[PDB]
Structure 1
Amino acid sequence: MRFDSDRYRPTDTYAEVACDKVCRAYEGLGRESLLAFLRDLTDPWGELPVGTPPEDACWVSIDGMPLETSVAWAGRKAGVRLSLESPRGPAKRRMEDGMALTRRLAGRPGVSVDPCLRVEDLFTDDDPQGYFTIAHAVAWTPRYKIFLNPAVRGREQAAARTEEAMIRLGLEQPWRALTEHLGGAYGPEHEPAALAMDLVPGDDFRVQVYLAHSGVSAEAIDAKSAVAADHVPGSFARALRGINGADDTPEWKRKPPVTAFSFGPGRAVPGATLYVPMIPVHGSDAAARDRVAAFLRSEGMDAVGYEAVLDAISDRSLPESHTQNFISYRGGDSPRFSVYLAPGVY
Structure 2
Amino acid sequence: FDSDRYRPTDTYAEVACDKVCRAYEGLGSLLAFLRDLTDPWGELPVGTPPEDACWVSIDGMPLETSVAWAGRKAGVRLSLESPRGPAKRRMEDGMALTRRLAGRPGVSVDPCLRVEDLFTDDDPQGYFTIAHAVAWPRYKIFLNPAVRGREQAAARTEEAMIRLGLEQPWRALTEHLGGAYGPEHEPAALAMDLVPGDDFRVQVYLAHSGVSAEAIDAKSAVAADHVPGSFARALRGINGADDTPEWKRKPPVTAFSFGPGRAVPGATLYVPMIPVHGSDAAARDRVAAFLRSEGMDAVGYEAVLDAISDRSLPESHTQNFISYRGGDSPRFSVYLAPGVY
Same-fold status (TM-score > 0.5): yes
* Per-residue deviation, 1:120: 0.0
Matched, 1:163 2:151: no
1:108 paired residue number:
104
TM superposition shift of 1:244: 0.0
Q: 1:261 Cα shift? A: 0.1
Partner of residue 208 from structure 1, selected from 192, 200, 203: 203
CA shift digits 1:65-98 (9 cap, x unpaired): 0000000000000000000000000000000000
* Aligned-residue offset at 1:123: 0.1
How far apart in 2 are the matches of 1:272 and 1:106?
28
- Which among 294, 317, 325 is matched to residue 289 of structure 2? 294
Superposed CA offset, 1:33-85 (max 9, x none): 10000000000000000000000000000000000000000000000000000
Q: CA deviation at 1:245?
A: 0.1
Secondary structure at 1:81's aligned position in 2?
strand
1:1-346 matches, cutoff 5 A: 3-30=1-28, 33-140=29-136, 142-346=137-341
Distance across 2 between alignment mates of 1:274 and 1:89:
32
- Number of aligned positions between the proteins: 341
Q: What is the rounded CA distance, in whole Å, between the counterparts of 1:170 and 1:329 in structure 2?
A: 27
Instruction: Specify the SS of the correspondent of 1:203.
Output: helix
For residues 209-265 of structure 1, give each alpha carbon's deviation from its aligned partner in whole angstroms, at most 9, with x where no partner exists: 000000000000000000000111000000000000000000000000000000000
Give, in angstroms, the shift of residue 18 of structure 1: 0.0
3-state DSSP class of the match of 2:126?
A: coil
- Could you tell me the percent identity over the aligned residues? 100
* Deviation by residue 1:293-317 (Cα, 9 ceiling, x = unmatched): 0000000000000000000000000
**C-alpha displacement at 1:134, in angstroms?**
0.0
Give, in angstroms, the shift of residue 191 of structure 1.
0.1
1: CA distance, partners of 2:321 / 2:107: 27
Taking the aligned partners of 1:296 and 1:262, their CA distance within structure 2 comes to 23
Deviations 1:109-149 (A, max 9, x none): 11000000000000000000000000000000x00000000
C-alpha displacement of 1:189 = 0.1
Q: Structure 2 unaligned runs (5+)? A: none
What CA RMSD, in Å, does the superposition of the two structures yield over aligned residues? 0.2
1:155, CA displacement in angstroms? 0.2
Offset at residue 289 of structure 1 (A): 0.1
User: What's the offset of the Cα at 1:4?
Assistant: 0.2
1:135-175: CA deviation from partner (whole Å, max 9, x where unpaired):
000000x0000000000000000000000000000000000
CA distance in 2, matches of 1:17, 1:79: 19
